[PDB]
Design a protein around this ligand. Structure first.
Ligand SMILES: Nc1ncnc2c1ncn2[C@@H]1O[C@H](COP(=O)(O)OP(=O)(O)OP(=O)(O)O)[C@@H](O)[C@H]1O
Ligand SMILES: Nc1ncnc2c1ncn2[C@@H]1O[C@H](COP(=O)(O)OP(=O)(O)OP(=O)(O)O)[C@@H](O)[C@H]1O
Ligand SMILES: Cc1ncc(COP(=O)(O)O)c(C=O)c1O
Ligand SMILES: Cc1ncc(COP(=O)(O)O)c(C=O)c1O
Ligand SMILES: [Mg+2]
Ligand SMILES: [Mg+2]
Ligand SMILES: [Mg+2]
Ligand SMILES: [Mg+2]
Ligand code: NA
Ligand code: NA
Lengths: 305, 305
């Protein structure tokens, strides 16, 4: 009847990040997703300016309490992403634990947002005290995690220089609890050329492993909200294709392809030839990608490792 | 691209305020930015509900952020249930500046003041809001959607018949808005007593330059239940379909009212099959009505007045 998702992420007025990047897509795919907005900002922090207010851990608990009092604390999935506050994350953990006791079959999709790699090596953009909570509290509770290379390294304590090392680090994260690990981006080399980024996916489930790889053509620009979109779409596609990590990843990545393809085109037309599109011009063309989200044309086959 | 700034309430579970208005508008291709005026666990018609509210200062701050980035350029502004006078005054100042930034901006205002329960009607917003609506908001509005009780409060006249309704509608036009739709009333229907009546009136200047007025009426059969959020959805869709059929109120209203019907029908059937349906079972089945929102099959035709 209904697949409900409790998604606790940022909200911006203008643009598509966090809950803004996750909601429309999931609703379009028929999920009863409920959005708890961890913050409400004018726009994402990639802009010259930004304003807003946050939601403290007490307010989050207050909201959970209202749902519980009405017996609306039964969800099929929980989805979380970027959080800057340690208190908030701990409160999130208590909530998932609770929702899990309420429904053992709940799937927690955790995007362990900690930072990223830029030119070569990267940096965190979350207070460091958060990492221990993610390693000790969050990830062990998670059923599906979506870190990028940097986050996978931080959560494992191991550096990743090759595909093999990435799969080993993924085995470590698996042992930490999550049955599905998908590294959403990395510096790994591709035979296709230098203009590619690699996605690796591992799923434990007769206990069998399924591992995949995808080589994605890089678009010349920095997008915001794509990691969030990736996690939400992975949530939707692993849902329709359980035990088929391959397809789930192909639909997720293809959906990202169409959205970004549509986004970079508009960004240019607006910026004009030879001019790099601004963050504003680079906002995901989300509503215009509705048909691509409903049924994405697979434009990337994933290789079975 | 058509940009809408919608300042209304947000709930975690259910569809009212920005939750009733956002998904449908996005489905229709509108770039709608949602400013959440409150964040509650659910709508206040449930046994319990908890949450926080946005104050006029935070609204001003969120707006300052859009402005600092030059993102205060909108085609439409949509407001609904507002609980605080200083908030409403802040909303008024915002709409003024936006209209200055763009003189073609259309302000769609749902002047939420109260309603009628059986025979008697009463307010559910601070009474000190009525003067602000009368002198500050409605004069800035291009499209208003009051229910019968609100048209009466705004006009200062009681409505006992179609004739009195049309006079208050002209009164409302003279206050400001070119489009006045009374979204519900207990006026008499030649089809029975179990009908609510919708009246619409739109003043526009045709190609030749003559100022004319289109007037319509719809007799909707009442369903046995109280829905929350349908008034919000009505305004949202009215915005969407008058945008599509700017010189045809009859069609705009027929698509708006037909969309509610399809939604309410699906909702009433997946509430009966659950049960009396409680507030939770009567939540608008928003996500499941996607197809109906995109292209509503017209099920009720309007009477030309
Ligand atoms: N410049 C780009 N070119 C092509 N695809 C991109 C680009 N940026 C993002 N993507 C798409 O978005 C996905 C996620 O990458 P991103 O770098 O946006 O997230 P992450 O950094 O992997 O996630 P997060 O920081 O939220 O944990 C990539 O797998 C790819 O599908
Ligand atoms: N019980 C019902 N039976 C049939 N249709 C209904 C019913 N309730 C709401 N509707 C639909 O929703 C529309 C809006 O009515 P509602 O009473 O929901 O809002 P209002 O009270 O008219 O608006 P507001 O938000 O300004 O108070 C009606 O015109 C109709 O299309
Ligand atoms: C507050 C906030 N939410 C969401 C996002 C989206 O993150 P990503 O670019 O990985 O999709 C960002 C990006 O930094 C952010 O700052
Ligand atoms: C915060 C809020 N938003 C929206 C609504 C829904 O209004 P309506 O049923 O007139 O569309 C309500 C109900 O009173 C409400 O409390
Ligand atoms: Mg990245
Ligand atoms: Mg992110
Ligand atoms: Mg009503
Ligand atoms: Mg309302
Ligand atoms: Na990621
Ligand atoms: Na109304």
């Amino acid at each position: 009847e209904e697949c409900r998702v409790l998604s606790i992420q940022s909200h911006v007025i203008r643009g598509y990040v966090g809950n803004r990047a996750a909601t429309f897509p999931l609703q379009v795919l028929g999920f009863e997703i409920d959005a708890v907005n961890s913050v409400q900002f004018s726009n994402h922090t990639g802009y010259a300016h930004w304003k807003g207010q946050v939601l403290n851990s007490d307010e989050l608990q207050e909201l959970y309490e209202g749902l519980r009092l009405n017996n609306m604390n039964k969800y099929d999935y929980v989805l979380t992403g970027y959080t800057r506050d340690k208190s908030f994350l701990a409160m999130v953990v208590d909530i998932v634990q609770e929702l899990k006791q309420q429904n053992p079959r709940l799937v927690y999709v955790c995007d362990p947002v900690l930072g990223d790699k830029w030119d070569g090596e990267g940096s965190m953009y979350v207070p460091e005290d958060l990492l221990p909570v993610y390693k000790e509290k969050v990830v062990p509770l998670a059923d599906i995690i979506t870190p990028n290379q940097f986050e996978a390294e931080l959560l494992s304590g191991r550096k990743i220089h090759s595909q093999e090392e990435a799969l080993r680090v993924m085995d470590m994260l698996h042992s930490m609890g999550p049955d599905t690990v998908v590294i959403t981006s990395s510096d790994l080399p591709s035979p296709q050329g230098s203009n590619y980024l690699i996605v690796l996916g591992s799923q434990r489930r007769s206990v069998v492993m399924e591992r995949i790889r995808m080589d994605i053509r890089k678009v010349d620009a920095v997008f915001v909200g794509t990691g969030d979109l990736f996690a939400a779409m992975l949530l939707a596609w692993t849902h329709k294709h359980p035990n088929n990590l391959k397809v789930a990843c192909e639909k997720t990545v293809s959906t990202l392809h169409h959205v970004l393809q549509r986004t970079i085109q508009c960004a240019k037309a607006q910026a004009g030839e030879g001019v790099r599109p601004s963050p504003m011009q680079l906002e995901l063309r989300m509503v215009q990608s509705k048909r691509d989200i409903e049924d994405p044309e697979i434009v990337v086959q994933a290789t079975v490792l």
